[PDB]
Design a protein around this ligand. Sequence first.
Ligand SMILES: Cc1cnc(-c2ccccc2)nc1-c1c[nH]c(C(=O)N[C@H](CO)c2ccccc2)c1
Length: 331
Amino acid sequence: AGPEMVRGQVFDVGPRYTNLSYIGEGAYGMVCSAYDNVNKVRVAIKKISPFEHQTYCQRTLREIKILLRFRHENIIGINDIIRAPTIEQMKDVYIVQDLMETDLYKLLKTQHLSNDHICYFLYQILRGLKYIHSANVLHRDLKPSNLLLNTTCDLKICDFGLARVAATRWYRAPEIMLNTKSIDIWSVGCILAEMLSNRPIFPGKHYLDQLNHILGILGSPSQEDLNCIINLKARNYLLSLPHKNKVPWNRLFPNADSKALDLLDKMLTFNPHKRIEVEQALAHPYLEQYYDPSDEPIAEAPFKFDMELDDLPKEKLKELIFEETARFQPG
Ligand SMILES: Cc1cnc(-c2ccccc2)nc1-c1c[nH]c(C(=O)N[C@H](CO)c2ccccc2)c1
């Protein structure tokens, strides 16, 4: 048959994986649904072409290393990895994963969620995050498009490219734009708010406008909220702004559950030190119906990269990518 093509990208995944269809995109790749003739199921195939940039190579290696060690119901896994037999011919890497039904970005673009489903989705994000954080790892890019859903409404966290050992502007914590595990909680806060109204709570266009949108609902920050190593330009901008009143949560979300708004308030806290932790959020009365610490596992040990991935050249990272994927080759 030969190599399959989808929206301009060539996928050399045959003869095992055939009849490919478009399901997503990334900065240096494409996601496709394909038929696996061995397991007789449709699977997801993520093609990545990162070898022209050092940043894309480390983002690829970080994800592959994290997803292979992690084993959790609310985190996407790796079933198989395809690449050329030699390093000289390895221009692409194909990550084979479980095919999902939809993602939260698509679901919030077409459907209105009931409180029970908002509560069940939030629980699963935090259940998965509890495992990520227990491993001393930060996702750093939590957003509706990185939250995958199946037919039975089971959630799975994907895209561990930007993950680091303890991004999209709209779900970015204020402290990142001023100067930790709390940055993921802020993102979950933004996701919860988007589930309640089917729209982004803070749709900023640039870093200071993103802060302006946050201050537009939270109001002007206190002295303690600004007691950190702030960027001079950002500090001088915040001090030059007129007083902003705090928009109450029940006013912004009129028909939302009062318990959901209390947890939302604790997640969308300007000061990261006063922000609720993942285990504290799971214990909140809003998620009482699903809260079960006996069925909320943690990682066996903390995760650590033996090498300084940031300092390694593009060629050295390719060698490590080639070595990490060697286990999936026949022999
Ligand atoms: C593994 C998987 C399985 N099924 C589906 C899926 C199925 C049906 C409808 C929507 C998505 N998505 C995924 C999935 C979606 N995004 C990603 C995913 O890894 N996306 C990132 C960018 O966020 C990426 C990064 C670099 C190159 C390409 C892609 C995986």
